[PDB]
From Swiss-Prot, chain D:
Segments in the Extracellular topological domain: 1-536
Species the sequence originates in: Rattus norvegicus (Rat)
Name of the protein in question: Neuroligin-2
Subcellular location as annotated: Cell membrane; Postsynaptic cell membrane; Presynaptic cell membrane
Family per similarity comment: Belongs to the type-B carboxylesterase/lipase family.
Full-protein residues shown: 40 to 608 of 836
GO biological process, one term: positive regulation of inhibitory postsynaptic potential
Membrane topology: Single-pass type I membrane protein
UniProt KW Transmembrane helix keyword: yes
Gene: Nlgn2
Amino acid sequence: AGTTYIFSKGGGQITYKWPPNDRPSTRADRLAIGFSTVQKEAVLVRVDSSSGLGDYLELHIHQGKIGVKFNVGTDDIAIEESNAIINDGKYHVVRFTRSGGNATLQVDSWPVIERYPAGRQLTIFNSQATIIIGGKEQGQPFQGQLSGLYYNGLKVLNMAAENDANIAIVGNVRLVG
Amino acid sequence: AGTTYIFSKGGGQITYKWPPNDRPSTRADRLAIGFSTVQKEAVLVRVDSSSGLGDYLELHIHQGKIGVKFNVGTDDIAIEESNAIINDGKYHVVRFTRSGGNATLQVDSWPVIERYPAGRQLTIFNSQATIIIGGKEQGQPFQGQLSGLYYNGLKVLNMAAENDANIAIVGNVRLVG
Amino acid sequence: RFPVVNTAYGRVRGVRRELNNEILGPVVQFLGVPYATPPLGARRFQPPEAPASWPGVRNATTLPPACPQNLHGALPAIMLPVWFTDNLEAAATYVQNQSEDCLYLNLYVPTGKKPVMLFLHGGSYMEGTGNMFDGSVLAAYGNVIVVTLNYRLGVLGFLSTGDQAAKGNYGLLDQIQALRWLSENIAHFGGDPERITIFGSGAGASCVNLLILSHHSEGLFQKAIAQSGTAISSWSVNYQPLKYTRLLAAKVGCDREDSTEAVECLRRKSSRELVDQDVQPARYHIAFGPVVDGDVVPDDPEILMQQGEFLNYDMLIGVNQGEGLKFVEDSAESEDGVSASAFDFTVSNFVDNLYGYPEGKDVLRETIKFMYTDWADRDNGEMRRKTLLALFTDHQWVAPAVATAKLHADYQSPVYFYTFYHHCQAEGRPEWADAAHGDELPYVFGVPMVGATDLFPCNFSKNDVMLSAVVMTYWTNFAKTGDPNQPVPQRFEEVVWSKFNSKEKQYLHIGLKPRVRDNYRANKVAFWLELVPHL
Amino acid sequence: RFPVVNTAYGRVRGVRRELNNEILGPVVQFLGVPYATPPLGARRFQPPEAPASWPGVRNATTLPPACPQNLHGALPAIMLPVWFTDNLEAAATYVQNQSEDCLYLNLYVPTSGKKPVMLFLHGGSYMEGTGNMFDGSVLAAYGNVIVVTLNYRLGVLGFLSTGDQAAKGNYGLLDQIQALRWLSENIAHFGGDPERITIFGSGAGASCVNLLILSHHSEGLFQKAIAQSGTAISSWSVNYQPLKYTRLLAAKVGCDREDSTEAVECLRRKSSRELVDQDVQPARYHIAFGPVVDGDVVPDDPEILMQQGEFLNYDMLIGVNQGEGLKFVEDSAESEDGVSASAFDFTVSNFVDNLYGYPEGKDVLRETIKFMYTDWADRDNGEMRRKTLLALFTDHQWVAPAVATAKLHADYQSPVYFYTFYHHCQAEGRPEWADAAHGDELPYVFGVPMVGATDLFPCNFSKNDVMLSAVVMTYWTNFAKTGDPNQPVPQRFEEVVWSKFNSKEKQYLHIGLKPRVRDNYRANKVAFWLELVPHL
Ligand SMILES: *[C@@H]1O[C@H](CO)[C@@H](O)[C@H](O)[C@H]1NC(C)=O
Ligand SMILES: *[C@@H]1O[C@H](CO)[C@@H](O)[C@H](O)[C@H]1NC(C)=O
Ligand SMILES: *[C@@H]1O[C@H](CO)[C@@H](O)[C@H](O)[C@H]1NC(C)=O
Ligand SMILES: *[C@@H]1O[C@H](CO)[C@@H](O)[C@H](O)[C@H]1NC(C)=O
Ligand SMILES: *[C@@H]1O[C@H](CO)[C@@H](O)[C@H](O)[C@H]1NC(C)=O
Ligand SMILES: *[C@@H]1O[C@H](CO)[C@@H](O)[C@H](O)[C@H]1NC(C)=O
Ligand SMILES: [Ca+2]
Ligand SMILES: [Ca+2]
């Protein structure tokens, strides 16, 4: 576990907003984060596009199963760790690689589940805008502990602990020390 | 009887040009003139519209028969005195009244010849600009005595003697008396 | 003084009313001198006849009664002038003594011999009167004799069936009778029976363009000033008289299968019973109006003037900047302009009502949606209300006026084109608007030089008075010599109003900054005259 | 001095050629350094690979041979730049040593941080051109940017395809991508920055730039793109029916086997000059051998691809000239009057027949595009019909596609800068009525005026031309340095701020002797071509 952040009652949200002229658009996505919580319904990280574009990426725990759902333009594609239980209070890490429609999701050292959609799928996540951690405004606030958020060469928590000018924190998001 | 203009060898022409802003358009027309000649083929008078418009009116003797032919927009209507020979050297007169498409031609004391063209015919004589006496431009010169040209209250021959500016005489036309 | 002038039928008396302004001479007004026998009984629905001589003398001092009409009814509110519909309560005062015997005229003689200017009123063919316009300021200023008449309107003046039972066009015949009375009776009043001008605005202007193409009016007049009107627009003539006359006959109480029987039954009914009947025509059309029969209007006015069936009259045609101000009437209550959902609905209804061709109703709609939209302000809103107003003005008033000006100038007749732009600042009229339909009548009649009347309560500045003087001088010069700038010289002193040649369609941009321009809305006019026929 | 720089495959010797002008420093030229294996034998009609390391030092001084082509043939003159068509004899001098092995690039290096890289993608069409024609030794010295001009397979040997797997096609685009990869992994030794690699080009080469944006092969190779007078959505940008022309060439060359693999194998045996001299003529306003939609380089057609945001947010600079279809009116350009009505009607009808050709309705489209493109204030001018015809061709082929691609790129939050060149150097043989034509912006970008007239540009150059050239390369080098044509180097050009191209507010900048930032370039005609003609 890297820079651990603790979420308490009520929760909160931490937002990393890219500069307007340096917003990235990438074919492939790489997410990785460790966590420890007992919540049955929560959202860990939400990645949004700019105004108008409907491209999105979301990671959430529903009914005790962690999963990632993304909209790349054609339709929503979701991959979930169905044959497991994750809200048992123990620390578990999750990794996710994306290539167009193809999505590989792994948790702990268990075998990687793969999703290979059929038909023509768009492959471009257009004009990333903000990284949201907490999911409180979405509708399912997250309470627990998070660590080591890695996103395509951007360690969100590591630079957030450095108090960079492009990160804003609100709520019960506290730093473990 | 009145002011008579004679035609010498070669030929001649008398042209009346209407003022640029005083060219009249008439639904009904009158044309009376006394003539005396022995030429088998000739043209006496010819009234033309302005540039572009195809409306015209002419009086001509063919094969010893005098007749009036006009174009008012639909078709050429020509009414000719057939049961008379007029180029015997005597002094005759001819009158022609036009109303709508209907025409009436009368020579001396002979019975009137009336023409009612079939179908609905154009009527208005649009923007008369010139009157031509002698018709040297057409190709048939005139050699004889002409007097009393009456055209809708206009006496071209009378004004020609009084040295009217608009009236122009070109060729071998001489005034008698 | 109460001078008396002898006419060919008798002797009439008038008054010598004085004007408010101090630069105009006294004007002798003869109000209510008849010009035809009253068409009351069996003479109803018949062409007018010459009046009856009277013994002794007759004052003409009270305004004559107006023709029967239903002003508080379903009049066509699109073709009517804006000041008529705005001040409908004040304009109803003038038509208060309505009677069937309404054939009269009023002369305003000022104090070679002075010309005559006849005014043909009428925003539509079913309303208005000649008593509204006091042509006394124009008479004194221009030293011309202004005549304003009352002619039969509506059912009593334009009902027709197509056959010889009721040919129609009784209003045009009444106007021609008034012209004849002026021709054979104006020499006694000091007028010149050889310099008669005829002019009017609105549907009356259409009457002017239907008197030029009429065989009846050959030598009665020699000039014409048709402003904001045409005989080729959609609401100028009536091509389905039998349908609407049968609808009216069925509604009133007798619809005989024989046309003559129906006409004879109608002649037995009171004027107010069948005038008050509400027969609604199709949109952008009329129910009762001029009809093509063969006597007054021989053929279609669009076909008649293409073949040059007119007698070479000097013409002064004109339009306004935006005349379809009443086309956009439901969109004047919105802070913004019209929404994108309100711009494709008005255009669709416009195409359905006016063209309505199933084969090409989806191609024409798209191309006239694309043409009348500002692509530099595609999502402005206000510049969609402006473009809708421009679309209606271009189709109804500007394109027919340009077409008729071209047709008249092609056959070598003097045509002068004008485009009124200035407008008096009214009370309730929107600020974004411009010179609406019939907004030049106050300036032509010298309303600003006397003040705001009931019909025009608008505030007038010095610029309005100057423009009124300018336009009145232009009109009077045209009446005097057929040239707007020849007799009386007047940035308005150095502008030479040139002719309207077909090759270069020069005109005068009448307004606060006049200038002789080159082509008035060439793109849209060419769109309506050349491309739309090809589609 | 002949400096030596070690690349990743060996060491190359350059030169230190100096410039005529005074304010420009010396330039080092590594002319002719290879970047891929020669596609000579069985490697013909195959994608390029990495080069072969040479033990020792390679002398890189002479201009490398140009790729096989045929200038004195049946070239499509409508799409070629005006200066290339006019001076064809002078331009043929550069293409004199043509050989099949032509995969070489030339670097020009000057002498605030690490210098950027500007690759130039030449080619008025896909059958002609060479990187030796443009000397980038002036732009490199002025803007302190390493300028790289390459040579890639052209015409028959570069873009032949059948749709099957026998010959996928777009070998020229693969050569360009290989050159970009070589620059990315080898420019650090010459002093360049492998993270600021702009690519720019004019004419059909600019199309390649657009076709290099929608391709996933060139993901991280370059960062920016300057596409001037070119698009990937015009009529002559992509070849949609390669099989017909390939089979026609195969029949005309000798072997037309029914199976595509056998035909390709036979074609690989013909020498490079026999299959190039063949006269395979495409339909008018189209191309015979060009980029082909297959799935590897171009996944789908470029028009569909850019609608659904299939690009990776490249800073982009589009531009057009005033009138580029100068060769649309060439049969009626040496007459006292302009175009008669009987000839305007015929030209518009031929245009509609060749381009649209819709059996459902053409008696409506012809009349509406005739009415739209005519001045009704001077309807009978005659001379003002050549201008309208030139505007028609320019609007349909060059202006509307450029505006459409700028709007589609700006709709996904990518910096888009639109320019409209309006000045033209006074040519000896060009008509006086003619305005800035196709390819007349290339002399200014490369700084020809500050050096003088050449064989390719025999023009007079005054002081105004020199000032405009300096300004144009200042803008281009600022864009290369920072992606914003106003930031790094201060500049009626002093008080003009070049703004982005928003879809709602299409602000552009008007290059010329009277610069100004305007709001909508030909909004009426562009909207006509984009939003009305599709409805008809
Ligand atoms: C997804 O996987 C399929 C099958 O392995 C492959 O054909 C496709 O190219 C992959 N998509 C991407 C974007 O790599
Ligand atoms: C011409 O004659 C016919 C038959 O007599 C008549 O009906 C018609 O009215 C006449 N034309 C004119 C213009 O009077
Ligand atoms: C006309 O009116 C005046 C004033 O009302 C009146 O005195 C006069 O008698 C009237 N005229 C006649 C002929 O009665
Ligand atoms: C209209 O004119 C009157 C009289 O000059 C003036 O008092 C009034 O203020 C003017 N209009 C307005 C709204 O001020
Ligand atoms: C390069 O040129 C030098 C001098 O001409 C010569 O000595 C050397 O061998 C050359 N090298 C190659 C690879 O041609
Ligand atoms: C440069 O312009 C002058 C006119 O000022 C012209 O005569 C001259 O020929 C031009 N330069 C060249 C090299 O021709
Ligand atoms: Ca997308
Ligand atoms: Ca005629």
